[PDB]
Paper text:
Methanothermococcus thermolithotrophicus is the only known methanogen that grows on sulfate as its sole sulfur source, uniquely uniting methanogenesis and sulfate reduction. Here we use physiological, biochemical and structural analyses to provide a snapshot of the complete sulfate reduction pathway of this methanogenic archaeon. M. thermolithotrophicus activates SO42− by conventional ATPS and APSK, but transforms it further by uncanonical enzymes.
Inside the cell, SO42− is activated by an ATP sulfurylase (ATPS) to generate adenosine 5′-phosphosulfate (APS). The structure of MtATPS was refined to 1.97 Å resolution and obtained in an apo state despite co-crystallization with APS and SO42−. The structure exhibits the typical ATPS fold comprising three domains (domain I, 1–156; domain II, 164–314 and domain III, 320–382). Similar to many thermophilic bacteria and archaea, the domain III contains a zinc-binding domain (320–343) that might contribute to thermal stability. MtATPS superposition with structural homologues shows a slight domain rearrangement probably due to the absence of substrate. All residues critical for the reaction are conserved in MtATPS, arguing for a conserved reaction mechanism.
Author numbering:
A (entry chain A), B (entry chain A): 1 to 382
The structure:
């Protein structure tokens, strides 16, 4: 098969050097609106076509459509609302104006404001997140938004500084990379942790029916205790060098603030990976879900409502390392009792390292452990 | 699918207790013909339906058809000639007579002689074995046969004494066993050696797409150096107990003298396994072939000429244990050089044990080794 960008064509909303030049000369005659970091990232994903066919923030009819149907008005799958919020005090502009969107003191984007509209916060929250419980991070963030959403097209002037720009290839680059290597089918594997054997098992299992693997670590906010992103990248570089043939794998990052919308977000992740050029998308259990809100297989079941998605989700059956079979196996072929079975848990393996323990090599490749240990502190303190 | 016996129906040519009674009272009025042990085994396989639809030894038109087309006159696949040979001196009978076939001083079968015919030994040999080189065991055995072949139906009175009768279930028993366990698809795995990890890998790999596995050790002539058959059976019993879930495997023996006909014999083995009730038949490299006569994949390629065989051959791609991946892998997913790779060789593993060495556990399950070692001598001295 061939991977076509969501909506037919890859969006490019980067500003010409002529536009960025004049904007900053004439910036005092443009209303400024402050945005959060998550939004500045959304704006680079719009500009670089990661959110194709979006060309800016959603207008009213599109927002309502996304809430009610997870589709755009024209029926194209779209499941995560991409919106810009302002309060009454922050609203120093009107419909038709051109405004500048600032992150701190940096102008990130100019925006042609098409529509300024209101919304029901309780409907927003319940429909996106399937709950109106304030304990849910996303419901809490929805309830904190400004009263007004602002729809219209953007042009990217500046982007938030990225330490790993070298790894952050945009969709036009990953597509050309797939084509150079002769890959017609490509499987996306999304992660925010170092690779364990379970991860490798799935990726090499996909290698049997797909030409290549696109490992796509997400750069986002870090809880205290997570692996530093540098660590995830170096660990994966060690894995590929030592255990993968050379023309089977591509590693590039993408910046994206998780909304923890559960199954509604798995569709979004598939759309982003489609835009990168992928034909297939591995989906695991509890994907982008928050415990006690979404079922483990919920994020798999939702793809039944999107036959038209044109990227193939891949669901794998349960598996575990067996210490008597000495192999990754499954219940159908292994008769051994629970003490021989080791289920893979990125969290248990991380806590091991945090507690000063060595993961067995049926959990973690020796060389991957040595790479993690080569950092004086591989974990975020903030 | 459902497994139907070759030709539609399972042959039973066992003699009634009334026939065996009178035959031995009136034996002095029946010509006796001495047969080889291989032939007495052929006769039990005919009687118990292992050779369905055969009901005795082939007549002239059928023999010619099998040589030229590997099919019976009615076009049914049949590839190995099942014939009874006598010399001029041994021929104490005529067409229409009823004769007794003796192995030593034991009457094994009575036979209604339909046809006594001649044949060209050089054609026989070249067509069955693809060579007329006397160095080929089968060509040498063909050249030693009596000048006359004898066609006609048999009835089994006595069979060669079998130490493992308890394991030698006939096709009517294995079919009923499959049905009792609810297996609709069954895969045959044929062997004459103890199980190594490669064997287990294939059998459990088949378990993913088939309901059960039918491991079918062949009892036949033993070269000096082979494992005793008792050892193969106990080793497999240890393997299943320790590494297989309980309702996935069935182990029964069959007695059969290999003709070393290469690909022509792989079709015969599939027909025998079909008659046992199997739907699928694993075929490995150099199956029933003699080195420097048949290609490694020759025995796979021949099934292209038998679409109508109604038992599905299974061909597996190359694989090997990797001592850095620590797993059975393949070239597509493993980049490591030749010193990390261990290809499975039942012969190399046997020579290890003969030379007093311990096979690594990536070659042989600890418990399987301990079972073999539990015999004071696990190898045949003659
Ligand atoms: Zn096990
Ligand atoms: Zn390897």
């Amino acid at each position: 098969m061939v991977s076509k960008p969501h909506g037919g064509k890859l969006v490019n909303r980067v500003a010409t050097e002529k536009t960025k030049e004049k904007i900053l000369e004439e910036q005092n005659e443009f209303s400024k609106v402050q945005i959060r970091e998550g939004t500045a990232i959304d704006l680079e994903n719009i500009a670089h076509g990661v959110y194709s066919p979006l060309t800016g923030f959603l207008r009213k009819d599109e927002f309502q459509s996304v809430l009610d149907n997870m589709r755009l008005p024209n029926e194209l799958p779209w499941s995560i609302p991409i919106v810009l919020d302002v309060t009454e005090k922050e609203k120093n502009f009107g419909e038709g104006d051109v405004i500048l969107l600032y992150y701190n003191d940096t102008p990130i984007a100019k925006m042609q404001v098409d529509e300024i509209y209101t919304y029901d916060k309780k409907e927003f929250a319940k429909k996106v997140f399937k709950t109106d419980e304030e304990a849910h991070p996303g419901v809490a963030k929805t309830y904190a938004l400004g009263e007004y959403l602002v729809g219209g097209e953007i042009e990217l002037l500046n982007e938030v500084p990225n330490p790993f720009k070298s790894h952050t290839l945009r969709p036009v680059e990953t597509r050309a990379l797939f084509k150079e290597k002769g890959w017609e089918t490509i499987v996306a594997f999304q992660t925010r942790n170092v690779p364990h054997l379970g991860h490798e098992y799935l990726q090499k299992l996909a290698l049997t029916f797909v030409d290549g693997v696109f490992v796509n670590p997400v750069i986002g906010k870090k809880k205290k205790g997570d692996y530093k992103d540098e660590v995830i990248l170096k660990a994966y570089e060690t894995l590929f060098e030592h255990y993968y043939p050379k023309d089977t794998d591509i590693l590039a990052t993408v910046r994206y603030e998780m909304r923890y919308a559960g199954p509604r977000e798995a569709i979004h992740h598939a759309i982003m990976r489609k835009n990168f050029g992928c034909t297939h998308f591995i989906v695991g259990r509890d994907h982008a879900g928050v415990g006690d809100y979404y079922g483990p297989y919920e994020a798999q079941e939702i793809f039944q409502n999107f036959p038209d998605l044109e990227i193939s989700p891949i669901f794998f059956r349960e598996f575990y390392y067996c210490k008597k079979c000495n192999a990754i196996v499954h219940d159908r072929i292994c008769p051994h009792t629970s003490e021989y079975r080791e289920h893979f848990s990125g969290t248990k393996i991380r806590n091991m390292i945090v507690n000063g323990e060595l993961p067995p090599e049926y959990f973690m490749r020796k060389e991957v452990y040595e790479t993690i240990r080569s950092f004086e502190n591989p974990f975020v303190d903030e």
